[PDB]
């Protein structure tokens, strides 16, 4: 039995998560209690599950717990893999690690000088597998593959907010520059550093988990030529939250830019825009926390104006962006009085609307009319209909979401104008700065869309892991059928397919008597007993459950329908496109289909386009882990760390690896280590044939190992069992 008296195990804790314990006896089969030795003393006994006979996780030998890849461990379970990263981060202060293809990075909240030119010059020209794990190792892998294969590459950075995704992308970008010298005629690195403060101001918001989080997929292309020398860059944007512009969750707030405007309303230039307060403005008052503790949004507005000035966008255009943003909030204050026969109206000289019409340079009478009524065209005649108060707020808020998304894209076009070059690229490396899985005790449309986006990236990752293993098996002349493929497309098809979760939400969005409760009733009728994946709480009819890769997630049905709406009447676009202001004609420079899609259908469009962009490039992968929530240097918390490992999905790739053949060793390394076990009569004139013969005597079952042309593959725990036999022979 591997349950001996020197073999430590792992016992759960509601605090330390996992405590190591040492066996005081050799466990015998059918024993119902096991005697253990904790770090606090031999004061513990262990009752074995009397229904399944389950024993605690065995600890790995001391010769295996010191490595830079989790794949080097024999036993592959949460206690062992959490501990391996923990000791590295605490004792050796190691931030990087490998999980097969994946690089992992634990944020040390402490200036590390492993980014000096002297480390860059030591790693340069050498093999990434001979070097220690580092951003430079995956960056120089991608550079080498781009030059050798003549094919574009992409590094996918993901994790929680504050985890180092931005920070790791800057180090990767610095390396891409230094590996080809410099671009002093373009200064792409300075322009990228000037873009990020203005991009996060318009694209990030405050959340209950973090004072600042990104709400979209940021994608930067780094271009190179035939000399593979960096010549320029481009900024791409995807999966942007639309609901945020209008709706705020409790203890959260809108995009930081909106409050930068609000805090700066004291200055004479912003005073002309007649900006008031965040409690008066609707798209901002809802959250209950307009200001962030320890942060001054007026100092951030000074920084973003300097960053715009470094990018070279005119101060006249900056003030134009501010004037538009002041306008869309005055528009949010336009409230409609209810009328008879499903109608509404606006008060005479309504002050938010008179200010809006003056700021946007449009006629009040036309703006008032196209909101008190709506147009309906036919093949014979045009007609005008009354519009309900609820239809008018939905149209106003869909219009506000649309015109902000156009303004965002306008700003991103100027960022591209600064980053691009007249010199054509021969090749390019992408960096994707996307997020991890999202879960809470109550989940909304936003969390659903975030998890749907993670499932697609996970499918690509799952396929790649299989593809590379299959290529390694074929190279070692080992049957592919011996590895199993674990994917997640059923969870994807459940959401986007016909009559799936998303298509029933679009159907309930178009139906005139559809409701959040009627959608929930449709989901219970269509997927409850037709998909074991789908689940439903018994003591409620307001929520539904979906199996996602990381864990199952429960979503509250209420709000989904309202948030999916994005329809806006084209006459309301026309009266703003005819603005006397110079910017609005350039914001709305086919539209008839686009102005009728739902948010969910726009999100699906965006995600599939990003998925095919990442499918064209050769992919690489890195995970960012935040070790605590107190922002303390080198402070590790097991509760936060195991949650991060789950969000990053790495506990499932470690499991796929363990279910297959994780540990693997060349016949010569195997011989060098276990020659002690071999007798003079056992050793042959060939070490390969020696190792094949003695391994079949040491381990009688033939499914425990796999013989290659150059290396032996092993199941989980089998190398630890050999090390146990090696130790038991010595003593």
């Amino acid at each position: 039995e591997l349950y001996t008296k020197f073999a430590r195990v792992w016992i759960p804790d509601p605090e330390e998560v996992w405590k190591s314990a040492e066996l005081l006896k050799d466990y015998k089969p059918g024993d119902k209690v096991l005697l253990l030795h904790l770090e606090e003393g031999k004061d513990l006994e262990y009752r074995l599950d009397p229904k399944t006979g389950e024993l605690p996780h065995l600890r790995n030998p001391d010769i295996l717990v010191g490595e830079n890849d989790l794949t080097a461990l024999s036993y592959l379970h949460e206690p062992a893999v959490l501990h391996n990263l923990r000791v590295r981060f605490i004792d050796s202060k190691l931030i990087y690690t490998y999980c097969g293809i994946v690089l992992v990075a634990i944020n040390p909240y402490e200036q590390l000088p492993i980014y000096g030119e002297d480390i860059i010059n030591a790693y340069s020209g050498q093999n990434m597998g001979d070097m220690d794990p580092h951003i430079f190792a995956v960056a120089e892998e991608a550079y080498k593959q781009m030059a050798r294969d003549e094919r574009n590459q992409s590094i996918i950075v993901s994790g929680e907010s504050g985890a180092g995704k931005t920070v790791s992308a800057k180090y990767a970008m610095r390396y891409f520059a230094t590996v080809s010298g410099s671009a002093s005629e373009a200064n792409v690195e300075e322009k990228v550093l000037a873009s990020n403060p203005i991009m996060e101001s318009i694209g990030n918001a405050k959340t209950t988990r973090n004072d600042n989080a990104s709400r979209f997929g940021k994608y930067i292309e780094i271009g190179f030529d035939k000399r593979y020398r960096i010549i320029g860059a481009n900024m791409r944007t995807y999966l942007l939250e639309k609901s945020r512009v209008v709706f705020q969750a409790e203890e959260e707030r809108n995009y930081h830019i909106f409050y930068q405007l609000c805090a700066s309303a004291k200055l004479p230039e912003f005073k002309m825009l007649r900006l008031g307060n965040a409690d008066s403005f609707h798209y901002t008052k809802q959250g209950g926390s307009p200001m962030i503790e320890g942060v001054d949004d007026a100092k951030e507005m000074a920084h973003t104006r300097q960053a715009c000035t470094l990018l070279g966008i005119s101060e006249s255009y900056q003030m134009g962006i501010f004037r538009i943003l002041a306008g869309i909030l005055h528009l949010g204050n336009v409230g409609f009085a209810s009328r008879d026969s499903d109608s509404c109206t606006i008060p005479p000289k309504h002050e938010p609307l008179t200010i809006f019409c003056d700021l946007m340079g449009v006629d009040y009478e036309e703006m008032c009319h196209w909101l008190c009524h709506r147009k309906l065209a036919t093949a014979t005649e045009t007609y005008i209909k009354p519009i309900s108060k609820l239809q008018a707020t939905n149209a106003r808020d869909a219009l506000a979401k649309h015109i902000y998304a156009k303004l965002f894209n306008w700003i991103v076009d100027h960022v591209n104008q600064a980053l691009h070059s007249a010199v054509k690229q021969h090749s390019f490396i992408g960096v994707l700065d996307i997020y991890g899985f999202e879960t809470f005790e109550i989940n909304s449309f936003e969390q659903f869309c975030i998890n749907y986006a993670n499932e697609k990236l996970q499918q690509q990752f799952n396929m790649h892991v299989f593809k590379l293993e299959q290529e390694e098996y074929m190279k070692e002349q080992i049957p592919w059928t011996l590895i199993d493929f674990y994917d997640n497309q059923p969870c994807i098809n459940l959401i986007e397919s016909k009559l799936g979760i998303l298509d029933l939400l679009d159907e309930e969005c178009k139906m005139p008597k559809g409701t959040d409760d009627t959608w929930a009733q449709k989901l219970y009728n269509t997927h409850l007993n037709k998909c074991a994946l789908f689940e439903k709480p018994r003591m409620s009819n307001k929520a539904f459950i979906i199996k996602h890769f990381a864990d199952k997630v429960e979503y509250q049905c209420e709000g989904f329908l309202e948030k999916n709406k994005d329809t806006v009447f084209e006459e309301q676009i026309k009266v703003l496109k005819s603005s006397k202001f110079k910017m609005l004609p350039e914001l709305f420079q086919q539209t008839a289909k686009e102005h009728k899609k739902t948010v969910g259908h726009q999100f699906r469009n965006s995600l599939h386009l990003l998925m095919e962009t990442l499918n064209a490039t050769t992919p690489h992968y890195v995970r960012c882990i935040k070790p605590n929530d107190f922002k303390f240097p080198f402070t590790f918390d097991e509760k936060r760390a195991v949650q991060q490992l789950r969000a990053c999905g790495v506990l499932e790739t470690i499991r796929i690896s363990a279910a297959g053949f994780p540990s693997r060793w060349t016949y010569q390394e195997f011989f060098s280590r276990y020659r002690v076990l071999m007798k003079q009569k056992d050793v042959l004139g060939d070490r390969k044939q020696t190792c094949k013969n003695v391994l079949e005597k040491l381990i009688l079952d033939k499914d425990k190992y796999q013989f290659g042309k150059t290396k032996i593959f092993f199941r989980a725990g089998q190398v630890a069992y050999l090390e146990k036999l090696r130790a038991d022979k010595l003593r």
């Binding site: 159907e507 009627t518 009733q521 449709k522 009728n525 018994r538 003591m539 409620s540 009819n541």
Partner: protein, 371 residues
């Protein structure tokens, strides 16, 4: 843990936790099933509805009664009713709290056994118990001695009790109850051309009954004032706006409790069964039963019934005996309140039939526990 308490009422279920002053859930024990054709292609649809969500769809639904004559007629409907109470109404796991249920005297042994079986087989209750409605409404009345007349929707019953001990040979169950008064009310409204035929229309006649009807202190006098003065008439507004005039029938429908001949029964009136069940008791204790006639159940909610029942018991009993008829205001929930009190007492854990007792001894353990 806090035990759950529920009255299995034949037309109205009450439910809550032990210690609650009043039942936190109350609804009609009605399943409603569609009777029309869905012509809206691609809409949200349900199979059958329960209580208030059946009553809001009357007409389009035809209505059912899982209990009749105080006994269960369909266990598949009762399973849905119980599911509703636990997860959809009280939102509580039945595996967490014990379940006290109720029943009328002279209820079949098979009805109690199958009710016991379902609680442990499908709802997986840790422990349960079935209590006679009478003893519970006497606990709510707060005396150790007294005869209860409990009259519900589907059954009416007399139970004399002394020093906490019932007299099982003296009890008298009667099938005349509030449903038969509703069925008679349709016939006597049809005499003025106000006919009704659907179960959805029967619910409107039932409202009319509960709103307008009352017991006469002297029928012959009330018939004479209805014929001569005619001032007893009331107009009622039906759901489509039309008014109907209801008078004379306002005292004739409940008078059936004292005169069962109206509906062709050979059975004696409610006062005569209270008198006869006291006469079955020992002569030394009758005086204490006459001093403690407890009214109970929703059919005892007729204006004037306590004064009549008195004139009627005083006419049968000796003139030396002090006839007293007590009627607890909240008669509709007297049984539930008594269950909520009983389930709270530290001296009730022995009565809880545990799952382990059911699994070992079989469903007939419920009878051994009770007797």
């Amino acid at each position: 843990t806090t035990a759950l308490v529920c009255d299995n009422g034949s037309g109205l279920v009450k439910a809550g936790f032990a210690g609650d002053d009043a039942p936190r859930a109350v609804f009609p024990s009605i399943v409603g099933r569609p009777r029309h054709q869905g012509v809206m292609v691609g809409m949200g649809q349900k199979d059958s509805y329960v209580g208030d969500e059946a009553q809001s769809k009357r007409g389009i639904l035809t209505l059912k009664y899982p209990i009749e004559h105080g006994i269960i007629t369909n266990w598949d409907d009762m399973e849905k009713i119980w599911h509703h109470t636990f997860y959809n109404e009280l939102r509580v796991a039945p595996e967490e709290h014990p379940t006290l249920l109720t029943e009328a005297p002279l209820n079949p042994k098979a009805n109690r056994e199958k009710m016991t079986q379902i609680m442990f087989e499908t709802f997986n209750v840790p422990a349960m118990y079935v209590a006679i409605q009478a003893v519970l409404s006497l606990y709510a009345s707060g005396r150790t001695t007294g005869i209860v007349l409990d009259s519900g929707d589907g059954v009416t019953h007399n139970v004399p009790i002394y020093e906490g001990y019932a007299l099982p040979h003296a009890i008298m169950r009667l099938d005349l109850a509030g449903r038969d008064l509703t069925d008679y009310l349709m016939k006597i409204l049809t005499e003025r051309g106000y006919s009704f035929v659907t179960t959805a229309e029967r619910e409107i006649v039932r409202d009319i009954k509960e709103k307008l009807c009352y017991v006469a202190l002297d029928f012959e006098n009330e018939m004479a004032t209805a014929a001569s003065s005619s001032s007893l008439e009331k107009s009622y507004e039906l759901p489509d706006g039309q008014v109907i005039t209801i008078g004379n029938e306002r005292f004739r429908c409940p008078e059936t409790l004292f005169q069962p001949s109206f509906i062709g029964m050979e059975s004696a009136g409610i006062h005569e069964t209270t008198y006869n069940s006291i006469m079955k008791c020992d002569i030394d204790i009758r005086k204490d039963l006459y001093a403690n006639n407890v009214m109970s159940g929703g059919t005892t909610m007729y204006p004037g019934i306590a004064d009549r029942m008195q004139k009627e018991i005083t006419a049968l009993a000796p003139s030396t005996m002090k006839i007293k008829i007590i009627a607890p205001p909240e008669r509709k929930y007297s049984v539930w309140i008594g269950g909520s009190i009983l389930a709270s007492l530290s001296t009730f854990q022995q009565m809880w039939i545990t799952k382990q007792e059911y699994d070992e001894a079989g469903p007939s353990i419920v009878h051994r526990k009770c007797f």
